[PDB]
Design an enzyme around this catalytic site. Sequence first.
Site, PDB file in Angstrom:
ATOM      1  N   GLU A 267       0.818  -1.389   0.113  1.00 44.35           N
ATOM      2  CA  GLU A 267      -0.059   0.069   0.050  1.00 44.35           C
ATOM      3  C   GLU A 267       0.945   1.319  -0.057  1.00 44.35           C
ATOM      4  O   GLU A 267       1.575   1.378   0.951  1.00 44.35           O
ATOM      5  CB  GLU A 267      -1.004  -0.038   1.154  1.00 44.35           C
ATOM      6  N   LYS A 335      -9.285   2.432  -3.415  1.00 46.73           N
ATOM      7  CA  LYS A 335     -10.048   2.031  -2.299  1.00 46.73           C
ATOM      8  C   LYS A 335     -11.317   2.566  -2.059  1.00 46.73           C
ATOM      9  O   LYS A 335     -11.596   3.811  -2.169  1.00 46.73           O
ATOM     10  CB  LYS A 335      -9.020   2.597  -0.946  1.00 46.73           C
ATOM     11  N   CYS A 387      -5.673  -2.939   2.764  1.00 50.91           N
ATOM     12  CA  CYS A 387      -5.614  -2.791   4.026  1.00 50.91           C
ATOM     13  C   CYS A 387      -6.771  -3.185   4.811  1.00 50.91           C
ATOM     14  O   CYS A 387      -7.632  -4.313   4.745  1.00 50.91           O
ATOM     15  CB  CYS A 387      -5.198  -1.210   4.278  1.00 50.91           C
TER      16      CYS A 387
HETATM   17  C1  LIG Z   1     -16.367  10.536  15.114  1.00 48.87           C
HETATM   18  C2  LIG Z   1     -17.840  10.798  14.951  1.00 48.87           C
HETATM   19  C3  LIG Z   1     -18.884  10.158  16.485  1.00 48.87           C
HETATM   20  C4  LIG Z   1     -18.158   8.946  16.929  1.00 48.87           C
HETATM   21  C5  LIG Z   1     -18.149   7.822  16.036  1.00 48.87           C
HETATM   22  C6  LIG Z   1     -16.521   7.180  15.680  1.00 48.87           C
HETATM   23  C7  LIG Z   1     -16.816   5.820  16.029  1.00 48.87           C
HETATM   24  C8  LIG Z   1     -17.631   4.747  14.814  1.00 48.87           C
HETATM   25  C9  LIG Z   1     -16.498   4.282  13.873  1.00 48.87           C
HETATM   26  C10 LIG Z   1     -15.508   3.392  14.069  1.00 48.87           C
HETATM   27  C11 LIG Z   1     -14.502   3.741  14.547  1.00 48.87           C
HETATM   28  C12 LIG Z   1     -13.156   2.634  15.056  1.00 48.87           C
HETATM   29  C13 LIG Z   1     -12.048   3.349  15.326  1.00 48.87           C
HETATM   30  C14 LIG Z   1     -10.679   2.299  15.247  1.00 48.87           C
HETATM   31  C15 LIG Z   1     -10.398   2.329  13.902  1.00 48.87           C
HETATM   32  C16 LIG Z   1      -8.907   2.653  13.339  1.00 48.87           C
HETATM   33  C17 LIG Z   1      -8.330   1.231  12.810  1.00 48.87           C
HETATM   34  O1  LIG Z   1      -8.948   0.102  12.761  1.00 48.87           O
HETATM   35  O2  LIG Z   1      -7.122   1.476  12.382  1.00 48.87           O
HETATM   36  C18 LIG Z   1      -6.692   0.942  10.959  1.00 48.87           C
HETATM   37  C19 LIG Z   1      -6.516  -0.629  11.005  1.00 48.87           C
HETATM   38  O3  LIG Z   1      -7.536  -1.376  11.302  1.00 48.87           O
HETATM   39  C20 LIG Z   1      -5.948  -0.971   9.815  1.00 48.87           C
HETATM   40  O4  LIG Z   1      -5.339  -2.300   9.569  1.00 48.87           O
END
Ligand SMILES: CCCCCCCCC/C=C/CCCCCC(=O)OC[C@@H](O)CO
Length: 511
Positions: A267, A335, A387
């Site tokens: 990536e 993506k 990813c």
């Molecule tokens: C921000 C607006 C109001 C709150 C809503 C936010 C939460 C709902 C959406 C989900 C968020 C998940 C946070 C962790 C994601 C980050 C993560 O996985 O990093 C990338 C990784 O997986 C890549 O392999």
Amino acid sequence: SHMAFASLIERQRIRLLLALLFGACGTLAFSPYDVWPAAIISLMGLQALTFNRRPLQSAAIGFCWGFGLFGSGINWVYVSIATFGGMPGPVNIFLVVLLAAYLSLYTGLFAGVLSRLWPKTTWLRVAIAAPALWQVTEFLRGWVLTGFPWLQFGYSQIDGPLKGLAPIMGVEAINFLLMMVSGLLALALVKRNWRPLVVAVVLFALPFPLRYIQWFTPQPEKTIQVSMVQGDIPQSWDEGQLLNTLKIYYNATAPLMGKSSLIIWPESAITDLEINQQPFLKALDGELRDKGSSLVTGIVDARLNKQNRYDTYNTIITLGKGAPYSYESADRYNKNHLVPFGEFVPLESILRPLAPFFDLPMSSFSRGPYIQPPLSANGIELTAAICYEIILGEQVRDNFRPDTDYLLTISNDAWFGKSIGPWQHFQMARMRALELARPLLRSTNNGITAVIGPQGEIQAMIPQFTREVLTTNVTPTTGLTPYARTGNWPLWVLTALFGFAAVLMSLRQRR
Ligand SMILES: CCCCCCCCC/C=C/CCCCCC(=O)OC[C@@H](O)CO
Ligand SMILES: CCCCCCCCC/C=C/CCCCCC(=O)OC[C@@H](O)CO
Ligand SMILES: CCCCCCCCC/C=C/CCCCCC(=O)OC[C@@H](O)CO
Ligand SMILES: CCCCCCCCC/C=C/CCCCCC(=O)OC[C@@H](O)CO
Ligand SMILES: CCCCCCCCC/C=C/CCCCCC(=O)OC[C@@H](O)CO
Ligand SMILES: CCCCCCCCC/C=C\CCCCCC(=O)OC[C@@H](O)CO
Ligand SMILES: CCCCCCCCC/C=C\CCCCCC(=O)OC[C@@H](O)CO
Ligand SMILES: CCCCCCCCC/C=C\CCCCCC(=O)OC[C@@H](O)CO
């Protein structure tokens, strides 16, 4: 002269602590621990700790169970926040706590709803209603605000006795059966009754022989040498640094031209705009073509649209034999599903009118379409995902074509260093190959590069945190798994029947 340890409120607090620990135990089900029985222990706790509770008490217990699971299971995101976020360490901890609490709302929702509609401790609650309701609340977790379906226990069965279910109905069928079997074990325990245990064991055992089914046929007349270049580039706007990166990748690739039919860079391997690298790409294209090899690589593409604005894409491009490089070629992948808080922030579009222009990001990523054709290189059809996208089983299945030869994922998990994050991600990537019965070529910056076989097995791998090339022979497969033909709609039908039957019975119990 009292028994404060035995008060009603204290008994509830004891349940919340146990819920915390039973949730955290579930993290051991996933890589790199890979203790698949821990998923059952963790779900048993959830089902048993919520018995004979008022709904709001059950919701609290389910929230604390989730807090143990996500608190221990996705705190690796801290590593990215703390390395690159510029924020105070206590803010970084709080943001991670906030994430774990948010995801725990869906497990509290599950527990609260289960308790309200099925208060009695019965086999219907745990074997019929809970699986159906878990499917709904976990769908919401993975859908609301673009979603985060991380830590689904079905993935812990990639090397387990239930893996044969995934090619038939997808990983969510394993989440379903695990909740059902763990509930029956919890029921046997609290009612000290052997009948739900026997049922649970039969149901857990019935899928065992499926793991021996090969829904595919290998095609050895199409076997090729594939190479994947793990540049292990540290995280960075220097054109010199860019050139040092092209040097690593080019020099690792040149000796493989004429030997490897397919060469893969991860990536955003080329950390420059595609429009600023035309001389490099067209020279590279010619060297690959004159030697009979093909190259697939990540790159960032700011493509001018018809409104004369720039759509910035996280992109895969192709070059060389059978994929003549061109800026206007359709042999590419953009993506679709951006990483929440990585490539966008949820709810940003609503708030943007008020933000000062100087505080907005310089550039934000655009989204490719939900369905895109397979990439084609050297005659090979590659269903691509970047990813995070490889964990979206339905979307991967929706882009899959029966003529797909390989699944392709390119990734950069360097953000999360030496944490368990990249391992959980790798584990979910393996489930896609098992579900669709195709080998999967996973090329990464420094973070589990490997070839996965058509039953989710690791055929080849290189260590993390090394500058090195993984070269091996790979053989494509053909054939359609049942899950590839249908998708997840058969599990939803089962969920609707289980749920219809349970709700009907709950309404009869009342009045
Ligand atoms: C921000 C607006 C109001 C709150 C809503 C936010 C939460 C709902 C959406 C989900 C968020 C998940 C946070 C962790 C994601 C980050 C993560 O996985 O990093 C990338 C990784 O997986 C890549 O392999
Ligand atoms: C010996 C009994 C008394 C001591 C234990 C007190 C009872 C609770 C122990 C377990 C705690 C459950 C976990 C709570 C999860 C949420 C959390 O702690 O804070 C997250 C916050 O962001 C919520 O908005
Ligand atoms: C090769 C076949 C593999 C598939 C096996 C998957 C098993 C789960 C699918 C659905 C099962 C139907 C639900 C049965 C639950 C009955 C129940 O809980 O009874 C418990 C009660 O008798 C205890 O006293
Ligand atoms: C009402 C309270 C606020 C809304 C609800 C809470 C929503 C979840 C809060 C999440 C906060 C940040 C989570 C960490 C994100 C880590 C991250 O960016 O990972 C992806 C990145 O490394 C990709 O390059
Ligand atoms: C979700 C709860 C737990 C799982 C319950 C379901 C158990 C399913 C057991 C296996 C059933 C085999 C399904 C039929 C597949 C045969 C079939 O489609 O044959 C044609 C084939 O080429 C399809 O690709
Ligand atoms: C009633 C029996 C007593 C209750 C406790 C038994 C069942 C639950 C086991 C207890 C705790 C689970 C701890 C394991 C999870 C911790 C873990 O590996 O975290 C790793 C992670 O933080 C790395 O970033
Ligand atoms: C990202 C924002 C998260 C807010 C978390 C609020 C809950 C604080 C947790 C403190 C003590 C444990 C009891 C919580 C019971 C209610 C709960 O959390 O979820 C209920 C569930 O029905 C939500 O839909
Ligand atoms: C931090 C992992 C602890 C493993 C032991 C499991 C039993 C204790 C409760 C389970 C999980 C932790 C709950 C608190 C939320 C986690 C959190 O915000 O961690 C941030 C920090 O780990 C980042 O490095």
